[PDB]
Write a protein that binds this ligand. Structure first.
Ligand code: HEM
Ligand code: HEM
Lengths: 360, 361
């Protein structure tokens, strides 16, 4: 009953209401024939449809001497609005000059590594990758189960580049969820329920190969947040960093979270002023992370798995990166340590597989 | 609604129904006076009472120029049955041979580091600690918030040794939660609602310093689980490793999860056979963990944060540890990489602070 359709015009996990939990994986294809990639996406499709659907691998195992077909730890759990979203990095189309799989002619127009930015401190292994898998659910164990079982299918075809995970709880009464800086996160997104707006901001309708119709580009930035530096700062510093008030989420000088931002009443280098002043829009769908103590600092290693969706990242996304990178007050408390851009195919129809129209 | 009382005879987080998420941290005290420790435990007590009770810090602060007193990320969240449980390591009472805080005379009777076990691969920095804090909630953001705000208060008195976190979802209809090997985990525990059994297995009543009355000992083992090796194994090898059927959770030859184990029907070195044949009992309250890819293996780094509670770890826990470390079939699939034992104080009464009966003279 917490079931999100897998099949559709679009992949789920993009305009789908934001779940609590994410696992975010990137893989590199080690196989040499597009035929092996085809079988992988076919199997991934059939398994994703089962995992998200609420169907359970039912009463079975006729041969004790074989491994179970499923790892079993989601047996008693609800589907918890599980979505699984697939994308492909530039290196899937071309790696080191070689068109490894004969796909270059079906390359998306805007798929390239993101440009270097000031204050970047990228670990190459924490970004890029041929394929990304974004697994979301309202229950961590459900999302981990889905990733693990998808990844088990890729053995021999791909190597896993990295796996991150994160969380972001919505308010008990539907309030915008707060990031680890304690600020409402997502206010500035247009309504994911507004088809017109999602069409103009997220969804590909033209100018791209047909496998991208109903698809989008997914930007990923792994951004370390220095909680100890932030927590020791004044409220004034924290609000002046954003250009919104912390509790209310209101733009400075406004009453409500949803009041429009008045650019002339917020600091010119506040986060919100810089992002908004590009005049561009993206759909941000981020999750917080914590990964134990950072050994180099001896403080919590925490941050944001930044994930946004936009139909044209050269028009919509890269200008924001540019506008923020030098001037953002948030630069005091953050540092990007991983980066990637992926193209997300349009939705799968019942009886097709993911990226069928790309792989042919 | 989702509020677990903080004050009581016992600390919460022990017999409390198992929440979904945990953050588990250890701290070392760098302060030299016990009066600094008294301050810390006082503040932690006031803060935990506020975090667990559901009261929210008034949003409004006079003085825009000061840091907010609360980090704010839980402002809109339910208390989610938050519990915070404190314990103390052997090094709180004596470190490097020095009784730093004049506490040695109040040391618990069974508090010492766990003995080395074969197959151990301990990272010494992933074990031990003067102080453990176990923070549990049904929502990870709530748990992290609590830990963060508690650790923020310890700046200047302690250093954080390590922070672990974990999850374990119970079934939609209250079925026993499954661990990452897909097996029900906890069946062999006695009921947390049977006062009689918790009093005889978990809760200290005598033979210990007063401040331990109503307390217990907390065993911690961070156990890496090699999911890739496990997943490739036959169902027969997985079930033989434990001595219960995976799906039903029933002991071999039995129909139901709850049926008594028949020792003669499971392998001698099966996990359950070895554990049960010690004759001893503990309360296990473990969570699974995943920490991204293991750089040494290229596979998921995943495992169990094993946490158990017992009134006398020398009697109940260590023989179990010894019997399993030697012979458990489960060793094929796992390795212990962190280890601790802490003494957890009796509960806090309203108007008192945690460990007051230890720290005050
Ligand atoms: C740790 C890093 C980040 C944090 C903590 C953060 C936090 C926030 C907050 C609190 C707001 C105001 C409320 C809202 O609209 O959601 C906001 C707005 C926004 N952020 Fe960020 N942000 C981060 C990084 C980024 C990056 C890397 C970009 C894009 C390159 C970005 C783009 C935006 C945009 C477009 C808005 C909406 C501006 C508008 O009102 O039109 N943010 N962010
Ligand atoms: C390393 C990961 C471990 C896993 C995956 C694991 C898993 C299990 C499972 C599946 C069961 C049977 C269902 C249940 O009763 O909970 C079980 C029982 C048990 N385990 Fe473990 N366990 C682990 C480590 C340990 C350790 C270190 C100890 C004690 C030192 C321990 C003590 C027990 C006990 C006492 C029981 C119940 C036996 C009885 O029925 O009386 N386990 N465990």
């Amino acid at each position: 009953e917490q079931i999100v359709p897998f099949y559709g015009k679009h992949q789920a996990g993009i305009t789908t209401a934001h779940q609590t939990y994410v696992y975010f994986a990137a893989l590199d294809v080690t196989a040499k024939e597009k035929s092996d990639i085809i079988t992988l996406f076919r199997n991934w499709t059939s398994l994703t449809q089962m995992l998200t659907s609420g169907k359970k691998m039912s009463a079975e195992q006729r041969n004790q001497y074989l491994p179970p077909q499923d790892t079993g730890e989601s047996a008693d759990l609800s589907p918890s609005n599980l979505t699984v979203t697939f994308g492909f990095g530039p290196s899937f189309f071309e790696k080191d000059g070689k068109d490894r799989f004969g796909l270059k002619s079906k390359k998306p127009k805007h798929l390239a590594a993101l440009p270097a930015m000031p204050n970047d401190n990228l670990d190459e292994k924490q970004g890029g990758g041929d394929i990304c898998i974004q697994v979301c659910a309202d229950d961590e164990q459900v999302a981990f189960h889905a990733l693990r079982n998808l990844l088990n299918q890729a053995v021999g075809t791909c190597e896993v580049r990295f796996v991150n995970k994160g969380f972001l709880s919505g308010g008990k009464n539907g309030e915008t969820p707060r990031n680890l800086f304690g600020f409402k996160d997502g206010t500035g997104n247009q309504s994911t329920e507004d088809d017109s707006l999602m069409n103009s901001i997220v969804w590909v309708q033209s100018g791209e190969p047909d496998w991208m119709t109903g698809g989008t580009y997914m930007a990923f930035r792994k951004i370390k947040m220095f909680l100890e530096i932030w927590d020791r700062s004044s409220l004034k510093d924290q609000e002046d960093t954003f250009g919104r008030r912390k509790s209310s989420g209101a733009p400075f000088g406004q009453k409500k979270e949803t009041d429009p931002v008045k650019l002339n009443q917020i600091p010119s280098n506040s986060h919100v002023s810089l992002a908004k002043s590009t005049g561009k829009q993206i759909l941000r769908r981020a999750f917080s992370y914590t990964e134990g103590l950072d050994p180099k600092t001896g403080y919590m290693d925490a941050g944001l798995l930044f994930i946004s969706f936009q139909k044209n990242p050269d028009n919509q996304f890269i200008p924001m990166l540019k506008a923020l990178s030098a001037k953002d007050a948030l630069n005091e408390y953050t540092q990007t340590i991983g980066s990637a851009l992926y193209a997300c195919p349009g939705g799968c129809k019942k009886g097709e597989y993911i990226a069928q129209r790309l792989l042919e």
